[PDB]
Amino acid sequence: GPAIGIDLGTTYSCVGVFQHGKVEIIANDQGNRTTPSYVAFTDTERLIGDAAKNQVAMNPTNTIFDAKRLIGRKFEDATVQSDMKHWPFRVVSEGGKPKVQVEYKGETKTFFPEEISSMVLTKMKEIAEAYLGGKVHSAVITVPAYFNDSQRQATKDAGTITGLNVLRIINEPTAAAIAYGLDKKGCGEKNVLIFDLGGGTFDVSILTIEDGIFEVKSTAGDTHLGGEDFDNRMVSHLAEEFKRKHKKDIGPNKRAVRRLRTACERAKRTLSSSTQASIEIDSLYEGVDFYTSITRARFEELNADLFRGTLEPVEKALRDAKLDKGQIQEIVLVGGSTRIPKIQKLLQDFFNGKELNKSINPDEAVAYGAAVQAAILIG
Ligand SMILES: Cc1n[nH]c(C)c1C(=O)O
Numbered sequence: 001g002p003a004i005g006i007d008l009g010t011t012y013s014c015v016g017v018f019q020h021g022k023v024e025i026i027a028n029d030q031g032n033r034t035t036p037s038y039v040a041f042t043d044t045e046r047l048i049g050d051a052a053k054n055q056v057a058m059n060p061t062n063t064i065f066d067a068k069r070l071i072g073r074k075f076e077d078a079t080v081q082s083d084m085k086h087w088p089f090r091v092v093s094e095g096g097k098p099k100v101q102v103e104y105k106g107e108t109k110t111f112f113p114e115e116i117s118s119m120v121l122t123k124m125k126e127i128a129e130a131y132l133g134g135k136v137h138s139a140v141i142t143v144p145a146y147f148n149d150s151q152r153q154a155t156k157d158a159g160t161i162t163g164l165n166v167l168r169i170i171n172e173p174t175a176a177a178i179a180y181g182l183d184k185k186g187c188g189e190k191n192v193l194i195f196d197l198g199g200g201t202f203d204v205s206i207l208t209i210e211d212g213i214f215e216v217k218s219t220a221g222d223t224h225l226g227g228e229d230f231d232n233r234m235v236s237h238l239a240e241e242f243k244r245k246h247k248k249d250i251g252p253n254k255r256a257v258r259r260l261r262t263a264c265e266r267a268k269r270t271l272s273s274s275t276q277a278s279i280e281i282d283s284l285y286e287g288v289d290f291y292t293s294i295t296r297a298r299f300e301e302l303n304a305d306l307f308r309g310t311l312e313p314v315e316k317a318l319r320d321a322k323l324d325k326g327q328i329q330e331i332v333l334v335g336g337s338t339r340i341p342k343i344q345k346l347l348q349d350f351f352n353g354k355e356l357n358k359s360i361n362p363d364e365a366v367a368y369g370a371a372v373q374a375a376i377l378i379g
């Protein structure tokens, strides 16, 4: 082909290739194995991916993210009207469809959600082409299992605009199950729970798999819960610590809070493999450094409700599928937040000690399965 898989994610995207019998997940030009689903418009240029996310603080009204929350919807939809209230960018209506409105080269422009997503897809396509050489022609692109046909078709339109032959739109939990070979493992029916906790969304899906055929039995979750919520908890804790030690409230100061959040995001990643993380911020406020450290136990304490709370969508997906938790044959971890040991422990204890499918980087599992599926389709 080449055989290409794209996870077009709400805040991050991932691209993989199936080559010499195996998947390789592809790092972008900054060496990052996942790429922000971000597009920024400036006085001179259109930035995509890491370049767009890196200047977001400097240009928030013209930096688009979350276009996946708009794609395939109507402007009048309850979710659109609700989501709009939390974005720093303007959303407007054209023929009843939402468009983002930005400043670009000193003029006002509007873009359909599939136009922003096509720009993200083009960046993923060029990432794959730098890695492979030559041109990428086709891709499997994934969507959430709860997406309707307008959302699916608008995702496909993004691919068409990019100039990709979209071989198939497949469900994200389905691609994760394919990554683990669960359609080929021990071939009756398998009940598979996919536990997908990303940066800003939480999706639980129950699939059945039989003779290589997938059926979505139930979906549950929280469309506004992710890793960013855990970082908010750490930011409040550490802002209070800075106040206690240095008698300075950084709360009213946008830059000090943003820099604290950057340190907290990085600390949280380290806490997935170490029991402590060090914060090293130079001149956080009024020339006062903030060098400190945080333990894993403290991180878990600050997030006790949020982590334990992820089991309620698990219980609801089971009740909707009319399954007892003992009837799940496979559990798959997806999304960067599933690396958190306390989340893995809670999920494993809920499932009476059952081992978790977790050996694939969870932020890459969806693109990994999409790349396998692409290989099958091109043959
Ligand atoms: C680049 C690119 N890919 N898709 C679109 C719509 C664009 C653009 O217009 O810049």
Ligand SMILES: Cc1n[nH]c(C)c1C(=O)O
Residues within 6 Å of the ligand: 227, 268, 269, 270, 272, 336, 337, 338, 339, 340, 363
């Ligand atoms: C990487 C990483 N390690 N731990 C976490 C929570 C992540 C992530 O990507 O969110």
